[PDB]
Design a binder for this molecule. Structure first.
Ligand code: BG6
Ligand code: BG6
Lengths: 474, 474
């Protein structure tokens, strides 16, 4: 017998500024590292970039009207740092703030709760130019100043805040895999910037307690819960290393203010552990969040990896299912295909029970409320005659995940809300447009920009009914 | 490259008073619940009991000399509460305290560190008669009077103390399985008694901070780390249930003063959650231990268990391999044979890497030092002419477990010592005498005490060499 979703459950949907806004140089916006990075030849699929994206900066009023039509309780979006401080640390651009003000007013005027994400990977290029951005402690006070500006300006209107979105992703992709700005492949630098990002997160949660005392705030972690392949003890030990190295490495710092000891020691033995200054541990431990943001898409199964074994694998860019290969850390663990779940054609696991497992792990380990900030299925959509997009695949994925959430709530996990990814189709950081996540189809592809018109998918109406029946009808 | 065992590592061996002492009615000792229980027909194998056991009460000088010959750094034993308070809570039996004084003096005169266990399952029968022993809050103050009696008498000479030894066993075997005193099969009563023992534990740790400010104290948990059968999400979820219900239910209280939420809610949904009094959480949270004691023998593998599925299983007390059957909680998990490890003739898994995994989990979850208070292999031994016992099976098991401890120390786990179970052969609570654990064979069986003579097994000389080289030579 399932509990119902609490009466004030935030049924949400989410975006990210670069992925959606466009207007990349209007009204005084400065350059971000993704403005520069995406125009480098060969970085992004068919040269796609966010100059226009889906042009939400100009079309937000139509976008919010579709949200109100849908009945969204909440909308999560990111603020573009380079719209607010074109220099990162110089004068504030009032036109930048004014757009987010207009967006929030538009949201409230329709009874939609705004959830403001502070950082979704778009640090101003000037700060990377001036001092290497996340590799310098100077970004801590610059990021604080930016966050305080938003707190003072929108705190009276925004209850829910997310600090850093998927810090493990932009640190990892940006400094170990070289796939994101700044395009670095250097684990020593990766963990230095990661540590500085941890301090930046902690500093702004501290500021938030001062400036928005009645608000709620937390980082959002890209969480892939680890599984052992089988009950072979070597495989279970590999799972212990993987969950601590991939997940606790970040979530223990968010929740407890301290890195896990075994992973630290392994980094120390390699000379990779971050530099620590007086006052770091005090700050990190004094910044408890109200919730743990969670972006979930899939679980990961691991097995034993000998000292000689797998390192970086082969990411699935194409869509040709089967093209991924095992990624690992020699001596600790390597990934392996989970024979008991389906995958998308991008080799992503379809594992809604894994969401319940991950929600249970966070509550069991930290006793924190959880806001699901991102969950969704990316797939090709066909526009059929009569403005019909039949994305039954997308409905099937979201339904099962929402079902497992309800089971998590019945187990006792405190789930504050759920933000499907995404509201409209949007620009993928690297893979262009044809892998869509939206409830609302946007009329463009990789070659033709067309007119960017919004078309309601079948999933739009499925999710309209979910919100109307507070989850009772799925 | 492995770290060495720390220079003050407590290389130990262990026993329990009922299992070893004998002299059940000598020198003013009162009856314990096990004196009474084991003499009820059908409770124990071939009617074996602790009347004589291996007569360590009279023979402790011989036994300590053998410890000294082996070069033991520490000896862990339990104090028989009914020797000290014959009626549990009245006047002290000075002769009872005097035995443990002579024992501790004998150990210190041979340079062996005593590790005193306060409770190893033998509450005096008179407290069971007066108010039902662990089922009544009365026991909190009675157990405290007894602990403080020991603290004041021996605190000057004993630095390392264990409170409750395997609370999860004597509570669940006593109140859920009906296999230990008081022979109850009632889940509601089991969790009430469990909660009272949590309070008794916290109360004496609190008293210890006053009476033995320089000592170190912890409970000792019977830890079987759980494994999922495979990466099937339903099986990983049964692992999450199993680890929380069987392990976190006790260790979270010991480390954090808090029961885990999902397990609590499942018990509440069944009317099984314990009665909580004002001030309980305050006491439980303000009694941090210096270490987590760990009794390890095996891991447990689990799979999905439907709500009509498995409950109590068949236990193996004979010695014929393949007799045990699955046990579980319907709707949460059930155990299953781990196909990737061997088992003993009693169906206990042999999983030395599981010890590393369990030690890693405790450090990762609680950041506590660990004292391994029990680990050993129980098997039939053959006494060969010339008083020779070749127990290579025991050496092999101890060697691989001690090896995995060093890998755990290298990972960063703070392991304070290792107490092999047991120093001499002793009486098994239910299994009689033939399932032997000792380094020192004791000449007796289930039918005759014979001359109870002590015979060093081959593993005696192996462990002697382990200690002499501080574990460099295994
Ligand atoms: O590469 P894909 O399939 O388009 O997935 C990208 C999505 O994956 C998530 O990790 C990001 O938070 C999103 O911003 C992004 O939309
Ligand atoms: O294997 P057996 O004979 O059932 O014994 C298990 C042993 O290990 C633990 O369960 C107890 O702490 C010991 O007292 C006991 O002797």
């Amino acid at each position: 017998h399932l509990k119902p979703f609490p009466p004030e459950f935030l049924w949400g949907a989410a975006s990210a500024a670069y992925q959606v806004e466009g207007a990349w140089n209007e009204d005084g916006k400065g350059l971000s590292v993704w403005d520069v990075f995406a125009k480098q030849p060969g970085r992004t699929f068919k040269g796609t970039n966010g100059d226009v994206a889906v042009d939400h900066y100009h079309r937000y009023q139509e976008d919010v009207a579709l949200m109100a039509e849908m009945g969204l309780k909440a909308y999560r979006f990111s603020v573009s740092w380079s719209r607010v401080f074109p220099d990162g640390n110089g004068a504030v651009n009032e036109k930048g703030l004014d757009f987010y003000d207009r967006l929030i007013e538009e949201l409230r005027n329709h009874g939609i709760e705004p959830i403001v994400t502070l950082y979704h990977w778009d640090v101003p290029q000037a700060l990377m130019d001036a001092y290497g951005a996340w590799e310098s402690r100077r970004i801590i006070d610059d990021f604080d100043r930016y966050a305080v500006t938003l707190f003072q300006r929108f705190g009276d209107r925004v209850k829910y805040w997310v600090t850093l979105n998927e810090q493990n992703i932009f640190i990892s992709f940006g400094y170990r895999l070289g796939l994101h700005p700044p395009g670095v492949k250097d684990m020593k630098r990766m963990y230095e910037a990661n540590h500085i990002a941890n301090l930046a997160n902690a500093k702004v949660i501290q500021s938030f307690r001062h400036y928005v005392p009645d608000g709620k705030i937390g980082p959002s972690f890209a969480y892939s819960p680890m599984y052992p392949y089988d009950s072979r003890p070597e495989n279970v030990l590999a799972f212990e290393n993987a969950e601590e190295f991939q997940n606790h490495w970040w979530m223990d710092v968010y929740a407890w203010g301290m890195y896990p000891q075994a992973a630290w020691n392994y980094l120390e033995s390699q000379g990779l552990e971050p530099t620590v200054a007086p006052g770091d541990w005090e700050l990190l431990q004094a910044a408890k969040p109200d919730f743990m943001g969670v972006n979930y898409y899939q679980t990961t199964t691991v097995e034993h990896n000998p000292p000689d074994g797998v390192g970086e694998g082969v990411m699935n860019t194409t869509g040709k299912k089967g093209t991924s290969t095992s990624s690992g850390i020699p001596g600790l663990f390597k990934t392996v295909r989970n024979p008991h779940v389906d995958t998308t054609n991008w080799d992503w696991a379809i594992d809604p029970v894994g969401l319940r497992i991950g929600l249970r792990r966070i509550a069991n380990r930290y006793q924190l409320p959880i806001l699901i900030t991102e969950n969704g299925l990316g797939e090709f959509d066909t526009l059929e005659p009569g403005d019909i997009v039949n994305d039954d695949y997308r409905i099937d994925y979201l339904r099962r995940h929402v079902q497992e959430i309800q089971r998590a709530i019945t187990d006792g996990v405190d789930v504050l809300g759920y933000c499907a990814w995404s509201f409209t189709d949007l620009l993928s950081w690297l893979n262009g447009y044809q892998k869509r996540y939206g409830f609302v189809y946007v009329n463009r592809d990789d070659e033709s920009e067309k007119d960017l018109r919004r078309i309601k998918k079948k999933s739009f109406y499925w999710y309209q009914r979910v919100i109307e029946t507070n989850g009772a009808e799925l």
